[PDB]
Amino acid sequence: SGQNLENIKKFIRAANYLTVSQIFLQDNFLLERPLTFEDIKPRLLGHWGSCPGVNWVYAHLLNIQKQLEFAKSGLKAAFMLGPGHAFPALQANLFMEETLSKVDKKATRNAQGIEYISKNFSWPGGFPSSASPFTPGVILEGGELGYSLSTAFGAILDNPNLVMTTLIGDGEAETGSIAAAWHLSKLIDPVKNGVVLPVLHLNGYKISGPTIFGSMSDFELIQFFHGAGWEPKIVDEYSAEDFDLELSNAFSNAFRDISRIKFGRNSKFIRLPMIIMRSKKGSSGVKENNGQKIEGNSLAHQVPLLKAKTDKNELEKLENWMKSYKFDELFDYERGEFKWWINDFLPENSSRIGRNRFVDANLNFKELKLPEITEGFGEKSLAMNAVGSLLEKVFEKNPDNFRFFSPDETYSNKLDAIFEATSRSWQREIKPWEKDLAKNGRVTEILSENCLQGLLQGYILTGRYGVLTSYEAFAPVISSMMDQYAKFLAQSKEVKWRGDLASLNYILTSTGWRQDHNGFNHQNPSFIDEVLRRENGIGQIFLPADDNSAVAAISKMLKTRNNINVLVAGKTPEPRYFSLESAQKQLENGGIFVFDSWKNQKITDWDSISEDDEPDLILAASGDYVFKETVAALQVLLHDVAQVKIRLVYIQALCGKGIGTFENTLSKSDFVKIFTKDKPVIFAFHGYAKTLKSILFDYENPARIQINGYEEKGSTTTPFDMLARNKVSRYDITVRALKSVSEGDKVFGSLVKEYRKRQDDALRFAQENSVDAPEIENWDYLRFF
Amino acid sequence: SGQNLENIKKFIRAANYLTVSQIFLQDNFLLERPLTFEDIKPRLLGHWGSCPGVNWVYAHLLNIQKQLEFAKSGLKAAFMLGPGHAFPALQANLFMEETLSKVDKKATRNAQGIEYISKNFSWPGGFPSSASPFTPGVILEGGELGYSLSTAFGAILDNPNLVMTTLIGDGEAETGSIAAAWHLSKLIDPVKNGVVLPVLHLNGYKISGPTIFGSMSDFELIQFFHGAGWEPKIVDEYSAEDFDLELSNAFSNAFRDISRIKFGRNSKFIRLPMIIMRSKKGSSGVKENNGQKIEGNSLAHQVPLLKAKTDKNELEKLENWMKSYKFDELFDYERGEFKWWINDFLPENSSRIGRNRFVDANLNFKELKLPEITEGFGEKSLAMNAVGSLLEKVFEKNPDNFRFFSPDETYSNKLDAIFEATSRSWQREIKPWEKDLAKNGRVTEILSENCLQGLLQGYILTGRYGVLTSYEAFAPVISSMMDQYAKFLAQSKEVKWRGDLASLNYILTSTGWRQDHNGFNHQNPSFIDEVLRRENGIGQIFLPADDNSAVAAISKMLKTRNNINVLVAGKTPEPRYFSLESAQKQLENGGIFVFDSWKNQKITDWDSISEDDEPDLILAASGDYVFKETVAALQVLLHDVAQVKIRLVYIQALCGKGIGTFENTLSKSDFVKIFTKDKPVIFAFHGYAKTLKSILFDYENPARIQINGYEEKGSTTTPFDMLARNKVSRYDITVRALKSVSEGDKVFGSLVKEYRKRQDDALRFAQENSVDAPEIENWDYLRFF
Ligand SMILES: Cc1ncc(C[n+]2csc(CCOP(=O)(O)OP(=O)(O)O)c2C)c(N)n1
Ligand SMILES: Cc1ncc(C[n+]2csc(CCOP(=O)(O)OP(=O)(O)O)c2C)c(N)n1
């Protein structure tokens, strides 16, 4: 180890030297001639305070891996960077090993490469300042802090030979997402899956002040993490030999992991180890500047020497800083390459940390096999039951790359049919009266919506499949996390060596239109608006009409790649309108159904519509609950006024580019064919009225379109009262249609009075009896089977 | 003490009986005649599992308050309900006092009130099923789990004599918001601000499964909660001979410790006590049904007997359950009132938990005194410095009801001028090289955006003032919590005894147009769109043009009541366009400025705008960065074309009802006057293009309006490159304008050519030199003062 210990010091010294070169230097990288004012970048950008901590961890992980390969191999280690602002330290480590040269040819480990990476850091058109899809071996960007611990647990599933080492800052540990994720070890079995190894950087400071975790003593830190289900060890820089103590720390930790993953002699809960390291922020850099305590203080976070290009005394400080690392003893200047010491340090080439086989996709991604599609039976359509039955067969046909995530809502959402094939993962004691709990369950449930999102994206980014479901009103809790993932997808489209991934799928049910045991607090359809705002061909919403439409919607979602999808439907018995055999699947090529009521003619070809025969009024809807009110309103209008020709339209899908899907998006010319150039359009929507207004802005004549939807008005009451409160009931729609057609008061004045009276009677019945009126309860609806 | 325990037991029995009555009965509440199928609600709604714990906590708190009042102490206790689905227990507890009768006259403590509260629970038009603004003494809705601990810590911020007892469920404790809030005791001094006493309801089950905290042992729980700054005590129903006796002892010891800490001394960090209560879920209810173990299991969460109105066996169980309480020994049936025992147990009417003087906003709200507006000027506008200077004086003139919250970005946002008046609160050790830390600081900083939002809304709901600032891109982290607050405001508008509250104010800066040390991750302008989505006269956005406009807007924000406000502006040196007096006039006219370039005439009154003399093109912008590009583009066109008339428009504020403020919102007729009915409009926006499209949907002729925004494209580069990447720059604005007037391409073709090569040259210079071109850097802009 004595020869090994000294070799690690050379690796850390060289990594530190290259980190400084990328931040400051524009020329004279090897320091052959004295530094001047022309060898400094015009704008200094980047961060330095946390960079020395990254260099320490990466070098010690490389030494451990070589020991593992020497005897009793099998375990492959990876690296996760939580503090994404420490990217220049990560770039240097991927350069000293030949990982970077496999993607970019100009990044060869010679004098030409040193100038290339140093000059192009943070340069316009060069490398970015933070982690991104352009860096090999990267799955977490780390921009918005707090989503590292949960993502590591998601990429560690079904990979028994992967050990993921994730670095978390002490400031980042104060986030709610990190605080909840410490209990994730109580639901995941580390024998059939891998092991997550977290490292707490604990440099003591945030941007401009101390940290909560830095103020705690040694006794407090051990007690807290030992109560969270871990085994922490503490190493601090205020000791005799930091590198010697760090070496024994990482060695003894990996020893525990091997003595636990292969013996399998434990049936109770396990205690995974973790590392807490304490160090001075910005170590080995500038100590003081104007007597202001740069090192060991929050002032080392960003660039320390701000005026190195203008101040003579700052230029000197930078030169003495870099000359502290004796780079001429590690690099051969005449040849232009490292000395022989580096090849001894990392002799094995296939299993280098930055090219891990388990973490990297394109080596594990496989197609998903879909079972046959069967119709639904009965008089009442139950959308959630049909989807739950289809997902049960998917679990059987793909026993290795499918998983399900929910915040204890699968029973409430009527999706428990998936429990005939698997259970819920649980590593603690199980009671005799408890059911559906197993150690190897493929469904993970926890009340933290952020932890569930982290596990799902860790699974998909490694090359697997998964689905997440929850209450619709509580989806916006993870709006920011979805946005960060959406930025990963758009950037990855410009990388030629990335490949393909499965899409992110959401099932949202138990909407606010039918919240019976709850009230106003559970009605918030804002998440689907957030998804539609991405503008790089990302974001699709499915709005099924019945159970037949639902099963082919989830089937289409499971076949799409590199996107984000959301499904919204109810869970209560509902009328069934369409047949699955041919009608409903044909709708999916466009996602719109058109019915011409005055001739009982269904339309599927948009070019058969004739200008000679057009409706006097168009009734439209999007959403199962608002479609039922629209069909009922058409029945009332067909009975009373026969001269008014009405065209019925339902929209099953919406995308960020317009109406329909990305594969088949409705054009502007077709929109004029369906909706006449100048005719009233009454449109009822499942969500906010402004969400649809933004989409319909780019279509023809938006002045004549009346849009109604949820308006943040409701309480605990009957389902009909909720529709009438927001003015989307059947009698609300039929009054609006009469007003729009002609004058609206010539003969329909008496009809408007009668329909208003009917609505008044129904609301009065509910108040007295707490039950919907028999006229609406036993309504006979239309069907297009 | 000997007589008190029996009174507590009687109180708990009565509360349980009333809870069951509210859940089930619609008639025969006193159980005189035998129960039949006609005395059951047609629709059973509600929850029962957590109800028994609330009764225990409330009764013991009442006993403690009476004891405290006896011993001449100034401590007043309040109650906070985390599990908002346990509302019927809280309603029963409030009814047994006179708190409910002080607000509703029909809720008197007799048989009429008993029937009134029992029948109207969850009834259409009656009381809701969850906590709401309609309940006295309520500030937290509790529909979305979490936020209770943070709101409680925000409530005790200037009330040294208020002790807030908050009840947290074990499933709720798994959320990140609750997980992060356990460290809030390291920033708040309890001696001068009050004490928070949290109770953990460890019933052991979520909706349909066990809990993370229920699986841990006593050793693990003690070690974990002692790891934070707390002193936990555990009482469990399973192994205790006298659960009520243990509960009383624990509460008495906790309050004795609170009094000793408050009134003795304070030198170092102080550990506050907390209570962990372990009990069987749904205790005292039905035990088994079809051999399924209702009690002590997750099946007791909702209504236990779903078919009591159709099953003979279920009807018997309900009758036995209710008769087990022996209500006839506590209620006088002939006089229809409680016996004398209740009057010997309750405290004096002033010292009752339901009416805590420190919680009501009506007894604490005071006006805010605004310092004189010193609209100073240097050479370049610095909006953040001007705002920070004004906020410094506000701190001095209101030394008791103003506070500031930020996630460690005070220095980064250029708002450190407020540090001449106050420091940052900190209760741990302070180092010699650290500055701006004090035990009594009025600025609280923590990286948890959820904790900061909880403290701010706890402060405002008690009747005080506060401001929150953060990064615009990371604002959407707390999007859901703002929505829950918005539901409180709309509901409380219908309550006639609520009163007035201050506004929720946000300052967002360091936008994505000038992120220099970060790239494409700190770029997300979605929070303002979420705020603009509430539809009850809530949601206002301010978009200042310079520092003079910034101070005018912040002064207006501090004077508005019962709303939510957001201000977005940059922090870099910028041109100055408007004077001290013109800016304030604009805000009182609708926040819009109009300039007629071909005549050098400014317009302030929308009447008398000549229809004969109208522009050929309208250039518009909203946002400081996009306004600079629009002014520069106007100069180029004025120089080159000089024959087409251009009108310049800037928008300073947007509301949920249209253009302007709620007090003064631009009308449809005025919109036609400013923007000509049929002329092209080129509009550049600071945020997403679809956010403005939804607002402009309701205005005149949307087909002729072109909108460009952030578009989700960028990386680490120069400021001009970022503007040009998203197609918002002076040259591409001039190209868009030239094509609009004559797209026939027979004219201005060479001009369209020339402007593109200028952009190409600028981008090439940026790529080569890492700085912007001198032609753009040294540009001379317009000014209107
Ligand atoms: C959610 C969020 N809030 C704020 C920021 C701004 N920010 C970037 S880095 C940083 C400090 C990180 O501190 P720490 O974890 O101690 O890191 P280190 O000192 O190791 O760099 C902050 C607040 C952010 N990136 N994300
Ligand atoms: C953020 C959020 N996610 C999910 C829910 C759905 N929900 C309502 S109650 C509940 C379980 C509450 O469990 P707990 O508080 O531990 O139990 P109790 O005290 O009521 O017995 C859940 C998940 C919610 N209200 N909020």
Short mmCIF file of N, CA and C and ligand atoms in Angstrom, two decimals, chain A residues 407 409 447 449 471 474 522, chain B residues 49-50 83 85 143-145 169-172 201 203 205-207 211 281 301, ligand 2:
data_model
loop_
_atom_site.label_atom_id
_atom_site.label_comp_id
_atom_site.label_asym_id
_atom_site.label_seq_id
_atom_site.Cartn_x
_atom_site.Cartn_y
_atom_site.Cartn_z
N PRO A 407 -47.87 6.33 -4.48
CA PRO A 407 -47.83 6.76 -3.07
C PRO A 407 -49.00 6.22 -2.25
N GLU A 409 -51.64 4.44 -3.13
CA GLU A 409 -52.91 4.80 -3.75
C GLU A 409 -53.39 3.77 -4.76
N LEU A 447 -44.99 7.64 0.73
CA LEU A 447 -45.80 8.85 0.64
C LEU A 447 -45.05 10.04 0.04
N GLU A 449 -43.72 11.98 -2.79
CA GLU A 449 -43.83 12.06 -4.24
C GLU A 449 -42.49 12.35 -4.90
N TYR A 471 -52.79 10.69 -7.20
CA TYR A 471 -53.92 11.60 -7.30
C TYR A 471 -53.56 12.77 -8.20
N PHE A 474 -52.46 16.25 -6.52
CA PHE A 474 -51.18 16.29 -5.83
C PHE A 474 -50.00 15.99 -6.75
N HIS A 522 -58.77 18.93 -2.90
CA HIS A 522 -58.36 17.85 -3.81
C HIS A 522 -58.82 18.11 -5.24
N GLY B 49 -60.20 6.61 11.62
CA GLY B 49 -59.05 5.95 12.22
C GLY B 49 -58.26 6.85 13.15
N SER B 50 -58.05 8.10 12.75
CA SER B 50 -57.23 9.03 13.54
C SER B 50 -58.04 9.86 14.52
N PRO B 83 -53.48 16.17 10.43
CA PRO B 83 -54.40 15.29 9.68
C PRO B 83 -55.77 15.93 9.49
N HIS B 85 -58.15 15.32 7.70
CA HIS B 85 -59.26 14.41 7.50
C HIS B 85 -59.92 13.98 8.80
N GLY B 143 -55.20 19.68 3.71
CA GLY B 143 -55.60 18.76 2.65
C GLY B 143 -54.42 18.06 2.01
N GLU B 144 -53.38 18.81 1.68
CA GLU B 144 -52.13 18.26 1.18
C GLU B 144 -51.19 18.07 2.36
N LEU B 145 -50.79 16.83 2.61
CA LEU B 145 -50.08 16.50 3.83
C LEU B 145 -48.71 17.17 3.87
N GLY B 169 -49.12 13.13 11.68
CA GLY B 169 -49.29 11.71 11.46
C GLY B 169 -47.99 11.03 11.08
N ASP B 170 -47.94 9.71 11.30
CA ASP B 170 -46.73 8.96 10.99
C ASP B 170 -46.51 8.85 9.48
N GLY B 171 -47.58 8.68 8.71
CA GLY B 171 -47.45 8.73 7.27
C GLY B 171 -47.07 10.10 6.76
N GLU B 172 -47.61 11.15 7.37
CA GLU B 172 -47.25 12.51 6.98
C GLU B 172 -45.79 12.81 7.27
N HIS B 201 -48.40 11.32 16.00
CA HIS B 201 -49.48 10.34 16.13
C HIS B 201 -49.02 9.05 15.45
N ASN B 203 -49.95 5.88 15.05
CA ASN B 203 -50.95 4.81 15.01
C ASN B 203 -50.51 3.63 14.17
N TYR B 205 -50.20 3.09 10.73
CA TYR B 205 -50.73 2.73 9.42
C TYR B 205 -51.06 3.96 8.59
N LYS B 206 -50.78 3.87 7.30
CA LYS B 206 -51.27 4.79 6.29
C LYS B 206 -52.64 4.30 5.82
N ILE B 207 -53.11 4.80 4.67
CA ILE B 207 -54.40 4.38 4.12
C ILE B 207 -54.51 2.86 4.08
N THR B 211 -46.41 1.95 8.20
CA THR B 211 -45.64 3.17 8.04
C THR B 211 -44.16 2.91 8.28
N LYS B 281 -54.90 2.06 15.76
CA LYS B 281 -55.72 2.87 14.85
C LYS B 281 -57.19 2.51 14.99
N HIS B 301 -59.25 3.24 8.42
CA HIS B 301 -58.99 4.60 7.96
C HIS B 301 -60.28 5.32 7.58
C1 LIG C 2 -49.30 15.01 -0.60
C2 LIG C 2 -50.39 14.01 -0.38
N1 LIG C 2 -50.21 12.78 -0.90
C3 LIG C 2 -51.20 11.91 -0.69
C4 LIG C 2 -52.36 12.20 0.00
C5 LIG C 2 -53.43 11.16 0.19
N2 LIG C 2 -53.68 10.83 1.61
C6 LIG C 2 -54.67 11.33 2.32
S1 LIG C 2 -54.68 10.76 3.90
C7 LIG C 2 -53.28 9.80 3.60
C8 LIG C 2 -52.68 8.94 4.68
C9 LIG C 2 -52.41 9.71 5.95
O1 LIG C 2 -51.70 8.84 6.87
P1 LIG C 2 -51.41 9.19 8.37
O2 LIG C 2 -51.42 10.65 8.56
O3 LIG C 2 -50.13 8.49 8.79
O4 LIG C 2 -52.60 8.47 9.14
P2 LIG C 2 -53.71 8.79 10.23
O5 LIG C 2 -53.01 9.73 11.21
O6 LIG C 2 -54.78 9.55 9.46
O7 LIG C 2 -54.20 7.54 10.87
C10 LIG C 2 -52.86 9.95 2.32
C11 LIG C 2 -51.70 9.30 1.67
C12 LIG C 2 -52.45 13.53 0.51
N3 LIG C 2 -53.51 13.95 1.20
N4 LIG C 2 -51.46 14.41 0.31
#
